[PDB]
Design an enzyme around this catalytic site. Structure first.
Site, short mmCIF file in Angstrom:
data_model
loop_
_atom_site.label_atom_id
_atom_site.label_comp_id
_atom_site.label_asym_id
_atom_site.label_seq_id
_atom_site.Cartn_x
_atom_site.Cartn_y
_atom_site.Cartn_z
CB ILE A 13 -64.04 14.36 -21.62
CG1 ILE A 13 -64.35 15.85 -21.39
CG2 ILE A 13 -65.12 13.39 -21.17
CD1 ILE A 13 -64.30 16.31 -19.92
N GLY A 14 -61.93 12.07 -22.25
CA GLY A 14 -61.63 10.67 -22.45
C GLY A 14 -61.59 10.35 -23.91
CB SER A 15 -59.47 8.49 -25.84
OG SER A 15 -58.99 7.39 -25.12
N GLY A 16 -62.24 7.39 -27.12
CA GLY A 16 -63.06 6.27 -27.49
C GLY A 16 -62.45 5.48 -28.61
CB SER A 17 -64.05 3.22 -30.96
OG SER A 17 -65.15 3.95 -31.47
N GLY A 19 -61.54 8.71 -31.64
CA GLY A 19 -61.02 10.03 -31.34
C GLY A 19 -60.97 10.27 -29.85
CB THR A 20 -58.83 12.14 -27.71
OG1 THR A 20 -58.04 10.99 -28.01
CG2 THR A 20 -58.74 12.44 -26.25
CE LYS A 33 -65.00 10.88 -31.00
NZ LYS A 33 -66.38 10.33 -30.99
CG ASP A 126 -69.47 3.91 -32.72
OD1 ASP A 126 -69.33 2.76 -32.28
OD2 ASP A 126 -68.87 4.89 -32.20
N1 LIG Z 1 -71.14 15.46 -26.89
C1 LIG Z 1 -70.45 14.75 -25.73
N2 LIG Z 1 -70.83 15.40 -24.63
C2 LIG Z 1 -70.37 14.98 -23.40
N3 LIG Z 1 -69.53 13.91 -23.31
C3 LIG Z 1 -69.16 13.27 -24.44
C4 LIG Z 1 -69.59 13.68 -25.65
N4 LIG Z 1 -69.07 12.88 -26.59
C5 LIG Z 1 -68.30 11.97 -25.96
N5 LIG Z 1 -68.37 12.22 -24.64
C6 LIG Z 1 -67.70 11.50 -23.57
O1 LIG Z 1 -66.13 11.54 -23.84
C7 LIG Z 1 -65.65 10.40 -23.48
C8 LIG Z 1 -65.00 9.74 -24.71
O2 LIG Z 1 -65.71 10.11 -25.87
P1 LIG Z 1 -65.93 8.89 -26.96
O3 LIG Z 1 -67.23 9.04 -27.65
O4 LIG Z 1 -64.87 8.92 -27.96
O5 LIG Z 1 -65.96 7.45 -26.20
P2 LIG Z 1 -67.20 6.38 -26.39
O6 LIG Z 1 -67.31 5.61 -25.15
O7 LIG Z 1 -68.45 7.12 -26.76
C9 LIG Z 1 -66.85 5.12 -27.66
P3 LIG Z 1 -67.18 5.70 -29.34
O8 LIG Z 1 -65.86 6.31 -29.76
O9 LIG Z 1 -67.52 4.45 -30.13
O10 LIG Z 1 -68.28 6.76 -29.44
C10 LIG Z 1 -66.84 9.52 -23.04
O11 LIG Z 1 -66.88 9.46 -21.68
C11 LIG Z 1 -68.04 10.24 -23.63
O12 LIG Z 1 -69.31 9.97 -22.84
MG LIG Z 2 -69.29 7.91 -28.28
#
Ligand SMILES: Nc1ncnc2c1ncn2[C@@H]1O[C@H](COP(=O)(O)OP(=O)(O)CP(=O)(O)O)[C@@H](O)[C@H]1O
Ligand SMILES: [Mg+2]
Ligand SMILES: Nc1ncnc2c1ncn2[C@@H]1O[C@H](COP(=O)(O)OP(=O)(O)CP(=O)(O)O)[C@@H](O)[C@H]1O
Ligand SMILES: [Mg+2]
Lengths: 264, 309
Positions: A13-17, A19-20, A33, A126
């Site tokens: 789906i994608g990666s954030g700050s 984890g992936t 994640k 966060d």
């Molecule tokens: N329980 C969940 N259900 C559906 N999508 C999720 C999810 N948790 C994260 N995602 C999606 O996965 C992708 C990356 O997740 P991630 O949470 O790591 O990025 P983020 O933009 O939230 C920054 P952060 O790491 O600070 O939370 C995002 O598009 C997020 O919306």
């Molecule tokens: Mg997030």
């Protein structure tokens, strides 16, 4: 508490700050994640165990439940999937046009979840609109809260929701309830302008340095014309540079509800 | 020079044969590394047969703004220069912005610096010339800055070539990248950190800060302790407050040329107005000292990684 290879993993789906995340299968529709931190010192793993423990118990309708952690494939955390789009996506990618009552509502439910989290002595640490989902476009679910050990201190992700003292990283631990309250004020800024802060500045290090030294804060003139006065005052109170001046969520919730009563 | 005209033309011809870029036409060869937001792959373009490097940026942004970015990256088609990384094309697909450029088997000077420990002043001479020439081409003929000068942005190859990449041709791209992806260190001038825009001055500072680091093998903010200088961290807010509040880095006393110490010092003075300009550096005494010199930069680079050429 710790699963062992039982889990299925799916589309990236994608990666954030920190984890992936991938769509997975710990049961129906889980979201798994894989953490950036992957070589856990045993001293770090112990704190992680106990933080997951405190997190297992948290149940509240504006909160996404945290289900467990798997170490054996790779150190991962597992949480419920969310069919809805995040609030950052609604505001800043597809530009969903909401009316003021629903924007106030989103603010209210977010405050309900934050108040539950602070009631149980959990600092979100966060809070971003990226981490607020709009479930079936109706309910609000806050995610990515707690887990202080995995976020290690270096900053990562986006600066925009971090308070001055969080950006400085000069206190013992800069994250506190009032750090969350600051982040929440940036989210109110988001709701009331349809816009991220510092839209006029495209130099990331400038933003870090200037909000660090209290020289720069959001431009509140860009709040839209149908924004209640009480809501704008509350926003400004959440965003005070000095943390001790910001309010706590019990009075934020009060404020927002008493506001929402006196509407047209 | 004769040879820049030769090689440049050859690039333009086999760029003429590339055609329109489509995702299914690239096969992944290997990984070239990742940054804060981008990932780079060494890839083969099947219809042409070329080998290139493909940067992939994943941004969560309005589609209007992404199409703006793609349009503005299209300007790279006209930024062709022996000090500028060759550019083939830019497009969007499957959630990703792709920037296709020529592959540089030397990698960036960031990595080269890890492999060599320090980079000799002799070699930093030729590097400085290449960067000044590139920044100059950008300014004079496209009125555009780099905005991100640093060793990871200076690429080299086994033919001895030194080229700039990742320069600020798309402001929307910069402002997108700004909304996420914090780093852990900074090459940002002290005038820019305080919200002052003194043009090309910002890039000269950055280069100076680069030079110091590759000359010693350490990011110089803060300066090393006297015991750690013997061998010849800070969260990013502390670094920025250090760049703003305290005096600039400096080369060691005797280990480096006097002219080289002067060159970096003029590059690193915190007042953007009295700091050296491109035309001054271009005629600085270290620059002529180094342009007269005849070095085997291609052979030096190969010795620092692999086989000679
Ligand atoms: N329980 C969940 N259900 C559906 N999508 C999720 C999810 N948790 C994260 N995602 C999606 O996965 C992708 C990356 O997740 P991630 O949470 O790591 O990025 P983020 O933009 O939230 C920054 P952060 O790491 O600070 O939370 C995002 O598009 C997020 O919306
Ligand atoms: Mg997030
Ligand atoms: N044309 C090219 N040819 C060969 N290697 C390249 C290349 N372009 C980029 N790379 C390699 O990819 C690596 C990462 O590239 P990228 O520009 O995304 O991150 P960066 O190393 O510049 C740090 P940051 O994201 O903070 O700017 C570079 O160090 C370089 O080694
Ligand atoms: Mg780069």
């Amino acid at each position: 508490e710790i699963p062992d290879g039982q889990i299925t993993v799916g589309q990236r789906i994608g990666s954030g700050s920190f984890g992936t995340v991938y769509k997975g299968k710990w049961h129906g529709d889980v979201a798994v994640k894989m953490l950036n931190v992957t070589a856990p010192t045993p001293q770090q793993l112990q704190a992680f165990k106990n933080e997951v423990g405190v997190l297992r118990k948290t149940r509240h309708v504006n909160i996404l439940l945290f289900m467990g952690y798997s170490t054996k494939p790779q150190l991962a955390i597992v949480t419920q999937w969310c069919e809805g789009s995040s609030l950052y996506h609604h505001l800043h990618i597809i530009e969903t046009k909401f009316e003021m009552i629903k924007l106030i509502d989103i603010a209210r439910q977010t405050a309900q979840g934050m108040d539950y989290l602070h009631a149980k002595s959990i600092i979100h640490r966060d809070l971003k609109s990226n981490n607020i989902f709009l479930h079936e476009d109706l309910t609000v679910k806050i995610g990515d809260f707690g887990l202080a050990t995995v976020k290690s201190e270096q900053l990562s992700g986006s600066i925009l929701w971090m308070a001055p003292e969080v950006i400085r990283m000069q206190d013992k631990n800069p994250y506190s309830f009032q750090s969350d309250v600051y982040a929440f004020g940036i989210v109110l800024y988001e709701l009331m302008t349809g816009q991220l802060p510092y839209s006029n500045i495209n130099n990331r290090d400038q933003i870090i340095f200037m909000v660090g030294r209290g020289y720069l804060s959001p431009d509140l003139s860009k709040v839209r014309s149908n924004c209640p006065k009480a809501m704008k005052r509350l926003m400004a109170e959440c965003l005070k540079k000095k943390r001790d001046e910001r309010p706590l969520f019990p009075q934020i919730l009060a404020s927002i509800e008493l506001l929402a009563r006196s509407l047209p | 020079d004769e040879q820049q005209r030769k090689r440049l033309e050859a690039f333009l011809t086999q760029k003429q044969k590339v055609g329109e870029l489509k995702d299914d036409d690239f096969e992944k060869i290997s990984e070239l590394g990742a940054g804060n937001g981008g990932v780079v792959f060494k890839v083969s373009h099947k219809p042409s047969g070329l080998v290139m490097a493909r940067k992939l940026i994943h941004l969560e942004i309005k589609p209007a703004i992404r199409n703006q970015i793609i349009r503005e990256l299209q300007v790279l088609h006209e930024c062709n220069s022996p000090y500028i990384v060759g550019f083939y094309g830019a497009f969007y697909s499957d959630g990703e912005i792709s920037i296709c450029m020529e592959h540089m088997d030397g990698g960036s000077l960031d990595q080269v610096l890890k492999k060599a420990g320090r980079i000799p002043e002799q070699i930093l001479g030729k590097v400085s010339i290449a960067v000044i020439k590139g920044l100059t081409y950008l300014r004079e003929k496209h009125k555009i800055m780099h905005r991100d000068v640093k060793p990871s942005n200076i690429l080299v190859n086994s033919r001895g070539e030194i080229k700039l990449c990742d320069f600020g041709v798309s402001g929307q791209l910069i402002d997108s990248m700004a909304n996420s992806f914090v780093g852990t260190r900074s090459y940002m001038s002290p005038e820019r950190l305080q919200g002052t825009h003194y043009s090309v001055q910002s890039d000269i500072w950055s280069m100076g800060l680069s030079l110091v680091e590759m000359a010693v093998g350490r990011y110089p903010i803060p300066p090393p302790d006297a015991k750690e200088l013997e061998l010849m961290p800070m969260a990013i807010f502390e670094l920025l407050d250090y760049i703003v509040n305290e005096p600039p880095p400096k080369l060691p006393s005797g280990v480096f040329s006097l002219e080289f110490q002067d060159f970096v010092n003029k590059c690193l003075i915190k007042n953007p107005a009295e700091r050296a300009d491109l035309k001054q550096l271009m005629v600085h005494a270290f620059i002529k000292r180094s342009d007269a010199e005849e070095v085997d930069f291609a052979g030096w680079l190969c010795s620092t990684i692999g086989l000679n050429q």
